[PDB]
């Protein structure tokens, strides 16, 4: 549950440590927003709070 963003522009998950893309939120340098994961393995999508 929940993931934080990095300097490259992607948000990572704290359980496994995998990097993913986000729709309707923006992952461009944050490091402490709490972005949630949707569709692991096949999709790699996330919803961030704006």
Automatic annotation (TrEMBL):
Coiled coil residues, start to end: none
Residues spanning the membrane: none
Keyword NAD: no
Shown residues in whole-protein numbering: 21 to 70 of 70
Keywords: Pyrrolidone carboxylic acid, Signal
Organism, scientific name: Colletotrichum orbiculare (strain 104-T / ATCC 96160 / CBS 514.97 / LARS 414 / MAFF 240422) (Cucumber anthracnose fungus)
Record keyword Signal present: yes
Stated name of the protein: Uncharacterized protein
Modified residues (Pyrrolidone carboxylic acid): 1
Region (Disordered): 31-50
Cysteines joined through disulfide linkages: 5-11, 22-27, 35-48
Residue ranges with Polar residues bias: 35-50
């Amino acid at each position: 549950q929940e993931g934080k963003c990095t300097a490259k522009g992607e948000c990572q998950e704290n359980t496994s440590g995998v990097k993913l893309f986000c729709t309707s939120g923006s992952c461009a340098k944050k490091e402490g927003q709490a972005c949630t994961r949707n569709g692991p393995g096949s999709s790699n999508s996330a919803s961030c709070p704006k």
